[PDB]
RNA sequence: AACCGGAGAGGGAACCCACUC
């Protein structure tokens, strides 16, 4: 589950994203990489 | 001597020159109140300070 | 000879100093 914007608001002026949003970005980014990688390459080592 | 009545105080008063300091902790720099002013952004509670 | 107001932006993290006990 990913929380709504209220849980992780973004400030307007010093948009700087919340500490949780950056972690969400890492999660989704690596998820796409693994998804695509096991979809075609399926190399059984990089999957680990 | 009493300043209001003029009658001399029964006891004798210790009096003389002493060196006093005024500290920076004024009262006009501490007094404040609040009644529905600004609100935080994450949890919608009043600000601090 | 003829209408003619009106707002909305400042948040968080860290550190230091100080105060009342």
Swiss-Prot record, chain A:
PTM remark: The tandem heptapeptide repeats in the C-terminal domain (CTD) can be highly phosphorylated. The phosphorylation activates Pol II. Phosphorylation occurs mainly at residues 'Ser-2' and 'Ser-5' of the heptapeptide repeat and is mediated, at least, by CDK7 and CDK9. POLR2A associated with DNA is specifically phosphorylated at 'Ser-5' of the CTD by CDK7, promoting transcription initiation by triggering dissociation from DNA. Phosphorylated at 'Ser-2', Ser-5' and 'Ser-7' of the CTD by CDK9 (P-TEFb complex), promoting transcription elongation.
Domain of life: Eukaryota
Function comment: Catalytic core component of RNA polymerase II (Pol II), a DNA-dependent RNA polymerase which synthesizes mRNA precursors and many functional non-coding RNAs using the four ribonucleoside triphosphates as substrates. Pol II-mediated transcription cycle proceeds through transcription initiation, transcription elongation and transcription termination stages.
Name of the gene: POLR2A
Domain description: The C-terminal domain (CTD) serves as a platform for assembly of factors that regulate transcription initiation, elongation, termination and mRNA processing.
Protein name: DNA-directed RNA polymerase II subunit RPB1
Family: Belongs to the RNA polymerase beta' chain family.
Subunit note: Component of the RNA polymerase II (Pol II) core complex consisting of 12 subunits: a ten-subunit catalytic core composed of POLR2A/RPB1, POLR2B/RPB2, POLR2C/RPB3, POLR2I/RPB9, POLR2J/RPB11, POLR2E/RPABC1, POLR2F/RPABC2, POLR2H/RPABC3, POLR2K/RPABC4 and POLR2L/RPABC5 and a mobile stalk composed of two subunits POLR2D/RPB4 and POLR2G/RPB7, protruding from the core and functioning primarily in transcription initiation. Part of Pol II(G) complex, in which Pol II core associates with an additional subunit POLR2M; unlike conventional Pol II, Pol II(G) functions as a transcriptional repressor.
From-to range in the entire protein, with total length: 254 to 304 of 1970
Subcellular location: Nucleus; Cytoplasm; Chromosome
Disease: Neurodevelopmental disorder with hypotonia and variable intellectual and behavioral abnormalities: An autosomal dominant neurodevelopmental disorder characterized by profound infantile-onset hypotonia, developmental delay with poor speech, delayed walking, and impaired intellectual development. Additional variable features include feeding difficulties, dysmorphic features, and visual defects.
Swiss-Prot record, chain B:
Quaternary context: Component of the RNA polymerase II (Pol II) core complex consisting of 12 subunits: a ten-subunit catalytic core composed of POLR2A/RPB1, POLR2B/RPB2, POLR2C/RPB3, POLR2I/RPB9, POLR2J/RPB11, POLR2E/RPABC1, POLR2F/RPABC2, POLR2H/RPABC3, POLR2K/RPABC4 and POLR2L/RPABC5 and a mobile stalk composed of two subunits POLR2D/RPB4 and POLR2G/RPB7, protruding from the core and functioning primarily in transcription initiation. Part of Pol II(G) complex, in which Pol II core associates with an additional subunit POLR2M; unlike conventional Pol II, Pol II(G) functions as a transcriptional repressor.
Localization of this protein: Nucleus
Encoding gene per record: POLR2B
Recorded family membership: Belongs to the RNA polymerase beta chain family.
Organism whose genome encodes this protein: Homo sapiens
Function: Catalytic core component of RNA polymerase II (Pol II), a DNA-dependent RNA polymerase which synthesizes mRNA precursors and many functional non-coding RNAs using the four ribonucleoside triphosphates as substrates. Pol II-mediated transcription cycle proceeds through transcription initiation, transcription elongation and transcription termination stages. RNA-dependent RNA polymerase that catalyzes the extension of a non-coding RNA (ncRNA) at the 3'-end using the four ribonucleoside triphosphates as substrates. An internal ncRNA sequence near the 3'-end serves as a template in a single-round Pol II-mediated RNA polymerization reaction. May decrease the stability of ncRNAs that repress Pol II-mediated gene transcription.
Lineage of source species: Eukaryota, Metazoa, Chordata, Craniata, Vertebrata
N6-methyllysine modifications at: 24
Shown residues within the full chain: 1029 to 1077 of 1174
Name of this chain's protein: DNA-directed RNA polymerase II subunit RPB2
């Amino acid at each position: 589950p990913v929380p709504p914007l209220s849980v992780r608001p973004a400030v307007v002026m010093q948009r700087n994203q919340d500490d949780l949003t950056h972690k969400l970005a890492d999660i989704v980014k690596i998820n796409n990489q693994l998804r695509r990688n096991e979809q075609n390459g399926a190399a059984a080592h990089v999957i680990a | 001597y009493n300043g209001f009545t003029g009658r001399k105080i029964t006891s004798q008063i210790f009096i003389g020159p002493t060196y006093y300091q005024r500290l920076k902790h004024m009262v006009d720099d501490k007094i404040h109140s609040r009644a529905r002013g600004p609100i935080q952004i994450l949890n919608r509670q009043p600000m601090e300070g």
